[PDB]
Amino acid sequence: SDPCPENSNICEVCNKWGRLFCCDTCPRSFHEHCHIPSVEANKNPWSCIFCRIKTIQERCPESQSGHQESEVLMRQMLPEEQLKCEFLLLKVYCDSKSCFFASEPYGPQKPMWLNKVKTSLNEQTYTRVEGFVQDMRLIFHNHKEFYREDKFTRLGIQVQDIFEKNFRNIFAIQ
């Protein structure tokens, strides 16, 4: 039978089936380590990061001018900033092409990958928003060479675009 019939049969992030956790405030479902932060198995009720971002947004409607990028980057990683960074990281994973940047590469003076950023963010290693944003941009900085197969070049271009669009939407940057 379906134990959670009003929640998705498929992970919001990776669009695959399996062992899923089911949000109590929206129909979304997630693998334990696809959600960011990791799902707390014993939290009841549990609201996913989409619902928690929506709550923050509804209680602090944005200004018409928005924010400067440098103002945002200099922010201490207070709980709202941490959550927005987690949601921004998650929106990158939400693209299937993210898997090519998720794992440790097998060149650059500072390799970087999404699972390393996930770990650093979960351990709250970043003390400012800029620490997170800098590591995310390093991933794309490290891939600035034409690939023999153009599709691999276009891949980083598109994931970088996904990051930058979400970064400005989520933090409401000018």
């Binding site: 379906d2 134990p3 959670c4 929640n7 049969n9 498929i10 695959k16 089936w17 399996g18 062992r19 899923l20 956790f21 089911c22 109590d24 479902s29 799902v39 707390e40 198995a41 014993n42 939290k43 009841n44 549990w46």
Partner: peptide, 8 residues
């Protein structure tokens, strides 16, 4: 958190 097992 509620959970379920799904399958393709």
């Amino acid at each position: 958190a509620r959970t379920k097992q799904t399958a393709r």
